Design a binder for this molecule. Structure first.
Ligand SMILES: *[C@@H]1O[C@H](CO)[C@@H](O[C@@H]2O[C@H](CO)[C@@H](O[C@@H]3O[C@H](CO)[C@@H](O)[C@H](O)[C@@H]3O)[C@H](O)[C@H]2NC(C)=O)[C@H](O)[C@H]1NC(C)=O
Ligand SMILES: *[C@@H]1O[C@H](CO)[C@@H](O[C@@H]2O[C@H](CO)[C@@H](O[C@@H]3O[C@H](CO)[C@@H](O)[C@H](O)[C@@H]3O)[C@H](O)[C@H]2NC(C)=O)[C@H](O)[C@H]1NC(C)=O
Ligand SMILES: *[C@@H]1O[C@H](CO)[C@@H](O[C@@H]2O[C@H](CO)[C@@H](O[C@@H]3O[C@H](CO)[C@@H](O)[C@H](O)[C@@H]3O)[C@H](O)[C@H]2NC(C)=O)[C@H](O)[C@H]1NC(C)=O
Ligand SMILES: *[C@@H]1O[C@H](CO)[C@@H](O[C@@H]2O[C@H](CO)[C@@H](O[C@@H]3O[C@H](CO)[C@@H](O)[C@H](O)[C@@H]3O)[C@H](O)[C@H]2NC(C)=O)[C@H](O)[C@H]1NC(C)=O
Ligand SMILES: *[C@@H]1O[C@H](CO)[C@@H](O[C@@H]2O[C@H](CO)[C@@H](O)[C@H](O)[C@H]2NC(C)=O)[C@H](O)[C@H]1NC(C)=O
Ligand SMILES: *[C@@H]1O[C@H](CO)[C@@H](O[C@@H]2O[C@H](CO)[C@@H](O)[C@H](O)[C@H]2NC(C)=O)[C@H](O)[C@H]1NC(C)=O
Ligand SMILES: *[C@@H]1O[C@H](CO)[C@@H](O[C@@H]2O[C@H](CO)[C@@H](O)[C@H](O)[C@H]2NC(C)=O)[C@H](O)[C@H]1NC(C)=O
Ligand SMILES: *[C@@H]1O[C@H](CO)[C@@H](O[C@@H]2O[C@H](CO)[C@@H](O)[C@H](O)[C@H]2NC(C)=O)[C@H](O)[C@H]1NC(C)=O
Lengths: 376, 376, 376, 376
C-alpha cells in the first residue's frame, strides 16, 4: 500500500524540505509508506499556487502540505473548502473558521498580550509587516482600547531595501521625541535582523530600550550582536532544546551533511521545520488510525480538474479531515491537539530573555493558564 | 466590427448592472459593437472567481470588467498580470503597482488626512471594517505618529446581525469613558446606515459630536434621519450632481423604469454605478482609438485555458493596457486619467457637510493641490 | 334563550372587533346566547351614527356597544337618555352625569396630577389634541391656578400629514427658547408615535428631558426607539400583564391567527380591546343576573323608530341600567364597579417608567388612595 | 309664489322670534312671500334637534334658520353637509370648514387679541364657559406662547348656581395672591351678570381692576351697577345705535307693544335679534337674486326622510348655498359679506369703554386693519 500527497515548498525552503524528508524517513512504516510529489514555486503567486494545486489534485492525492502567504491564503482556503481537500500548513493561521485546513502554527496574540501586561506596559510601539496579516495588530489595538494604552503603530514592509537605513534611522530618531524606549517587532527573520542591524548602527542597544520579538524563532536570528548592549530584549520560543525527543532529533540532525540534507548540519532548527516534522508525524498517525478503523478510501477514479463545473467533493475527504482533527501526540513543539476548525489547542510557548549568559527561559504560557514565572 | 468582453458582478449588483447596460447602449456606435459575457457569482469566493476568469478567457475576450474583494484581489491581480489580460474595476484600489489592472476608485487617504488636519483633530476614533482592507487605517496611524494624534481604532466587521444592536450600543457607551466626541466611519453604505441608526437610537446625533463618512457615497446613504440632530457631519462625493452631463444622465436615468433597469427610477446614484458608466466609456474610447491607430488585436487562435503550462500570454495585451492607461476623458466622477501603474490621477473629491437644509459642498481636494475651501 | 344587541365600530377597529368576538365566544354559555348586529361607520359622522342607532333600535335590541368621538358623544348621550337605551363604550368618558351610558375608560386627571406633583413640576408644557376633548387640559389649568405652575399648552390636532414634519420640529425648536425640558403628551397612539419619531429625529430623547404619555396605552406604543436615549419617560397602564387571568388571556390570544382574528397574534393588547373584552364580560354577567332574579325584559312589541313623536321609552330600560351599574367583577383592567352616573370607581392605574431593560411599574394610583409608590 | 322654510328657536328666545317676525313683515315683497314653520325646542337636545330637522325636511323646505349650542353644532353640520341643506344661524361660528352653513356672528379672537395687545397686557386671567366652545381659549393660549404671556385660565360653567357665590368669592380672593387685577370674561349675559354681581359683592369694582367682556352685547347687560366703581371696564359692540337705518329700526321697534311683539318695547336690542333681522334680509335677497337668475327650483316631489339610505341630495341646494354665499348688503351689523365656507368677512366691531358719562366708543376693528383709535 502507498499514498499520494503533495508538497508546496517555496523556492528557498531547503531546510524545511530537508526536515520533511527526515520525517518521511523516520516515521516511515512498511505498513503504509507515503509517496509525495513536491512542487516548488513562488508562494506569493496565486496563479502558480492554483496551477500546482490542480496538478496535485489531478494526480489523485488525498491530502496536501505546503506554505502560503497573505496573498494566497484565500485561494488555498477557497479551493480546499470547495473540493473538500485537507491542507496542512505551518504558515500563519487564518482569521476565520476555514475548514479543511490544519494550522500547526499556534496563536501568539494571547501570550504576547500576557507578556505585555506582565511587564506592566502602558505606552509602547508596534512595528508590523503585512507579510503575515494584521490579526496581531487588531488584537493589540482592541486590548489597548480595553486597557488605556498609547500604541504607536508603524509599518516597515512597504519600505524598500534601498531606503531602509535612511527610513529606519529616521523612525528611531523621531521616536525618542515621545520618550518611547519600549518597542515591539512583529516581523520575520530577515526584517528583524535588518532592524537589529539598524539598531546597532544607531547605537540604541543600550539599556532602557526594551525589545520584543513577536515570533517563535527567538533563537534562530542573529542575537549575539546585541546581547551585550544591556538592552531589555525578550522573545518567545516554541521548541525546547532541553527535552528528550527534541535532543535526540538534534543529535541525529546536526550529524547530517549539507549535501544530501541542506540546511541540516547545525545545532538549532527553525520552528517552521519543526512544525513540518510534526505535520509529517500527524499525517502518518491519521492515516494509520484510518487503516485501524477498517476503512478503504482509494479514489474510485481520476479525481478530475479544479474547473469541474459544478464542484465534485467526496465524503471520504471529510473523513480524512475528521481523522486529522482528532489527533493528540507529543512532537517537537509539544502537545498537538486540534479543534473543530483546525487551530491548535493546549500548547506551550516558552518565553525567553536575552541575558549576558545567553538566552534564558523565564516561564511559559498556555490557553488554560496565563503567563507563568519559573526562573526564580 | 464586434468585440467580446467579460463581466463579473456580485449577487446584488442590480444598480451596477443597470448602469453597465445604460452605458453600453449609450456609448455604442456602428464603429464597433461590444459583446459582453456576464457571469454573476460570490465575488468573495476565489474558486468561483477563477472559474469565471477561465471561462471568459477561453471565450476569447480582449478585456474584463468586474469587482473584487479582500479575498479575491490577489487572485485577480496574479491571473491578470500573468495572462496579460486587463481588468477594470471600481472596487478598492490595490496596495501596490499591479499591472493589467485599471483602478477606477481614486484614493482617499490624502483627502481624509487633509480634512482631519483642517478640522484640527488630535484625539478621535476610527471605526473600520475588513471589507476593503486596512490601508486607510495603516496610513492614518503612520501619519498620526508624525501628527501627534490619539486614535482609538475599532473593528465592526466581525459583528453578527443578531447581536449588532447590543454591540454597537456598547461601543459608544465605552467611548463616553474616553470622552470621544469625534469619530470616523470607514465602512460601506449598509454598515454606516446601521451605525447611524444605532447612534440616533442612543442619542449621539446631537450637537457636540462630529462624524466623517470615509467613503465617496456621502449622499448614497440616508441622512434625513440625522440631518436635524444638530451634530457635525462630513464626507466626500466624487460625483457633483450640479454639473451639465451628470444632470443630463440623471434626467435619462430617473425617467427609466425599475423593471428593465432596476435601481434606476431615482435621482441619486451610487459611485460604483457611476464608475461602471465611466468604465464603459473609457473602454469604448480605448477600442475606438486602437481601431483608429491602424492596429490589429484580433486573436489569431483561441485562448486555450488558464492552466496551460507554461503560461502563454498574447502580444496585444500590452498594447491594450497602454491604450486603457493612455486615456484622458471626463465623466461623472470627473476627469479620468491614469498612470503607468493604472491608478487614477488629476482627479477631484468634493468635500461635503450636512446642513439643516441640505448637504452642501464646502470645498474640494486634489492630488497636486491641497484641500481648497470654498467660503462663498 | 337568545338576546340581540348592537355594535358600532369605526373603520379600522380590527383588534377591537377581534377582542369582541373572543369575549363573545369565551363568556358564552347555554344559559343565554347573544345575537349582535354589527354596523361599521365613520364614528365622527353624527348622521351615520343616528342611522345606525335607529337601525339597531328598530331591530329590537336590549342594549348597545360602540365607540364615539367629540362630534358624536352628545348625539349618543341624548338618544340614549331619551329612549332609555343603555350604551357601553371604552371611549373617553363624558364631562357630566349622562344616564344610560356605561363608561369603561376610567378617569385620568387625578392620577396625572398626582404624578405631576410627585415629580414636583412647576414649569412645563402640555400637548393636547382635539380628539377626546379638553377636560384634562381644563383640569390641569384650574389646578395649576392653585398649585403655582407655569404651563405652555399647544395643540397638534389641526396639523396635516404633509407638513407634520416641519411643524413638529418647529414646536420643540420654539420650546428651547423657554427652556422647556419637561413635557406631557395627551394624544392618541399614532400621534404620540409621530411625536416621538420627530423627537428622536431632532435629538431630544437624550437625558435632561422628561416625557409623560397621558394615556393608558403606555406599552401600546413603540418605545424601543426611545428606550436607550437616556431621557426620563413615564406613563400609565390599566392592564397589568403580570397577572394570572390576563396572562392566560394573552396565552389564548397570541396563539390565535391573524386571519380570523386580525391584530391578535401578539403579546401586547390595546386597552380599548381590553375594555371591549371586559364590556362583553359585564354585559353577560348583567343579563345572567337579570334572568336569575326572576325577571322579564322581553319587549312585548316592536321598537318603532327614533322619531316617534312623542318619545316612548320602555320600562325595563331602567332595570337594565340598574343591572349594568350594579356589577362588581374583575377583568383585564382590574376591578369593575360603577356609580349611579355610570362611571367607574374603586379602580387602579399602574404608573410606569421606561428603563433601559424594560418598562417597570414604579407605583399605582387609586381613587380612595393617592399615588402609592413601590420602592421595592 | 311662496317658500317653505324652518325656524329652530329655543324656548325663551321671544325677542329673537319678535325680530324674526318684524323682518319677515318689513322685507315682505309680494313678488315672493315666505312661509316659515317655527319649531321651538330645547336646543341642547340633539334628539329633539334632529326631530325638528327631519320634520322641516319632510315638510319640503329649501333653507333652515335657527340656533345651536356646543352640544348640537356637530349634528347640525353633519345633517346639513350630508343632505345639502343650507342652515342659517347667528350662533357662535364653527371650528372648521363646515359647508351649507351661514354663520352670521363674526369672529372675535382677532379683535380681542388686538385690544389686548393695544392695552399692553402681559399677565392677566381668562374666565371661560363651554356654552360656546374653546376656540377663543385656544387662540389666547397660542398668542400667549407667541407673546410671552402669563394667562390664568379658569372655568366657571361647571360651577352650579347653588355654590356660585362661595366659589366665585373664593376665586376672586385667591386671585389677588398673584396680584392679578386685570381680568377677562368669556361668558354669556347670564354668567357675566352673575359675575358682576359677585364682583360688586366682594367690592372689587374699584379702579385698578380691568374687565373685558368677550361678547358683542356690551350694552345689553346690566352695567350701571358697576359704572361708578371707577373700574377699567371695556367691551365690544357690533351694532351702532347712531346710524340711519339702525336708528329708524329702533324707532319702529320701541313703539311696539310687548303683547304682539314680546321683548320689543325697548330702546336697545340684542345682537342675536339684530343678526336674525339681517338673516331674514339676506335670505330674502338670495331668493330674489335666484328669481332674477331665470331659474326654478321647486322640489320635484316630497323631499323624503333623514334616514333615507343612502343620502339623497339635490344640486339646486348647492345653487342656493352659492347664492347665499354671494350676498353683499348693509344691515344692522354693517357690511355682510361671506366667504366660500360661510364665515363673514369685511365687518366692523365697535369697541366700547364704560365711563362715568356712560359707554363711549373709542375705535373699531376689522379684518383688513388692526385696532383703530377714533375718540381723541
Ligand atoms: C528592564 O528590565 C528590568 C528587569 O530586569 C526592569 O527592572 C525593573 O523595572 C520595573 C518596571 O518599571 C520596576 O518596577 C517599578 O518601579 C517603578 C518606580 O516608579 C514603579 O512605578 C512601578 O510600578 C514598578 O513597581 C522595578 O523597580 C525595576 N527594578 C530593577 C531592579 O530594575 C526595568 O524596569 C526594565 N527597563 C525597561 C526600560 O523596560
Ligand atoms: C462642529 O463644527 C463647528 C464649526 O465647524 C466647530 O466650532 C468650532 O469649534 C472649535 C473648537 O471649539 C473652534 O476653534 C477654536 O476657536 C477659538 C475662537 O473661538 C480659538 O481661540 C481656538 O484656538 C480654536 O481655534 C472653531 O472656531 C469653531 N468654529 C466656528 C465656525 O465657530 C465645533 O467645535 C464642531 N464640533 C465638533 C464636536 O467637532
Ligand atoms: C429624571 O428623573 C431623575 C430621578 O427620577 C431626576 O433626578 C432628580 O432631579 C431632581 C432635580 O434635579 C432632584 O431633586 C432635588 O434633589 C436635591 C438633592 O440632590 C434636593 O436638594 C432638591 O431640593 C431637589 O429635591 C432629585 O433628587 C433627582 N432624583 C434622584 C433619584 O436623584 C431628574 O431631575 C429627572 N430629569 C428630568 C429632566 O426631569
Ligand atoms: C386703566 O386705564 C387707564 C387709562 O384710562 C390706564 O392709564 C395708564 O395706564 C398705562 C398702562 O400701564 C400707562 O402706561 C404706562 O406707564 C408705565 C409706568 O411704568 C409704563 O411701564 C408702561 O410701559 C406704560 O408706558 C399710563 O401711564 C397710565 N396713565 C394714566 C393717566 O393712567 C391705567 O393704567 C389702567 N389701569 C389698569 C389697572 O388697567
Ligand atoms: C494538554 O497537554 C498536556 C501535555 O503535557 C497533557 O498532559 C500530560 O500529557 C503528556 C503527553 O502529552 C503526558 O506525558 C503526561 O504524563 C501528562 N501529564 C502531565 C502531568 O504532564 C494534557 O493531558 C493535555 N490536556 C489538557 C486538558 O491539558
Ligand atoms: C487635469 O484635469 C483638468 C480638468 O479638471 C484638465 O484641464 C481642463 O482640461 C481642458 C481640456 O479638456 C482645458 O481646456 C482646461 O483648461 C483644463 N482646466 C484648466 C483649469 O485649465 C486636464 O486634464 C488637467 N489639467 C491640469 C492643469 O493638470
Ligand atoms: C375595591 O376593589 C377591590 C379589588 O381591588 C375589592 O376587594 C378585593 O375584593 C375581594 C373580593 O372579590 C376581597 O376578598 C378582597 O379582600 C378585596 N381586597 C382587599 C385588599 O381586601 C373590592 O371590590 C373593593 N375593596 C375595597 C376595600 O374597596
Ligand atoms: C367692505 O365694507 C365696506 C362697508 O363700508 C365697503 O365700503 C363702502 O361700502 C358701503 C356699503 O357697504 C358704501 O355705502 C360706501 O360708499 C363704501 N365706501 C366707503 C368709503 O364707505 C367696502 O366696499 C367693502 N369691501 C372692502 C374690500 O373693504
Amino acid at each position: 500500500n502507498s499514498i499520494q500527497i503533495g508538497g508546496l515548498f517555496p523556492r528557498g525552503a531547503d531546510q524545511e524540505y530537508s526536515a520533511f524528508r527526515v520525517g518521511m524517513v523516520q516515521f516511515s512504516t512498511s505498513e503504509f509508506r507515503l509517496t509525495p510529489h513536491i512542487d516548488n514555486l513562488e508562494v506569493a503567486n496565486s496563479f502558480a499556487v492554483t496551477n500546482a494545486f490542480c496538478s496535485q489534485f489531478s494526480r489523485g492525492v488525498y491530502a496536501i502540505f505546503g506554505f502560503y502567504d497573505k496573498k494566497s491564503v484565500n485561494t488555498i482556503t477557497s479551493f480546499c473548502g470547495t473540493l473538500h481537500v485537507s491542507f496542512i500548513t505551518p504558515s500563519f493561521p487564518t482569521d476565520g473558521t476555514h475548514p479543511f485546513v490544519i494550522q500547526m502554527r499556534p496563536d501568539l496574540k494571547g501570550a504576547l498580550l500576557s507578556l505585555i501586561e506582565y511587564y506592566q506596559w502602558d505606552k509602547f510601539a508596534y512595528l508590523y509587516d503585512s507579510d503575515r496579516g494584521l490579526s496581531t495588530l487588531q488584537a493589540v489595538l482592541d486590548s489597548a482600547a480595553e486597557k488605556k494604552w498609547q500604541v504607536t503603530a508603524i509599518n516597515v514592509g512597504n519600505i524598500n531595501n534601498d531606503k531602509k537605513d535612511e527610513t529606519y534611522r529616521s523612525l528611531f530618531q523621531d521616536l525618542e521625541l515621545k520618550k518611547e524606549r519600549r518597542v515591539i517587532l512583529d516581523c520575520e527573520r530577515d526584517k528583524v535582523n535588518d532592524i537589529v542591524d539598524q539598531v546597532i548602527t544607531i547605537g540604541k542597544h543600550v539599556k532602557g530600550y526594551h525589545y520584543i520579538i513577536a515570533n517563535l524563532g527567538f533563537t534562530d536570528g542573529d542575537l549575539l550582536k546585541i546581547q551585550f548592549g544591556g538592552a531589555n530584549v525578550s522573545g518567545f520560543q516554541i521548541v525546547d532544546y532541553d527535552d528528550s525527543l527534541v535532543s535526540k532529533f538534534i543529535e541525529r540532525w546536526s550529524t547530517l551533511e549539507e549535501k544530501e540534507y541542506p540546511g541540516a548540519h547545525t545545532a538549532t532548527i527553525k520552528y517552521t521545520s519543526a512544525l513540518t516534522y510534526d505535520a509529517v508525524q500527524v499525517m502518518t498517525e491519521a492515516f494509520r488510525n484510518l487503516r485501524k478503523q477498517r476503512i478503504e478510501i482509494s479514489r474510485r477514479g481520476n479525481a478530475g480538474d479544479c474547473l469541474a463545473n459544478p464542484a465534485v467533493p467526496w465524503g471520504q475527504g471529510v473523513e480524512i479531515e475528521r481523522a486529522l482533527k482528532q489527533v493528540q501526540v507529543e512532537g517537537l513543539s509539544g502537545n498537538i491537539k486540534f479543534d473543530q476548525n483546525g487551530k491548535r489547542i493546549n500548547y506551550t510557548i516558552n518565553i525567553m530573555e536575552l541575558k549576558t549568559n545567553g538566552p534564558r527561559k523565564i516561564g511559559y504560557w498556555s490557553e488554560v493558564d496565563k503567563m507563568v514565572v519559573t526562573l526564580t
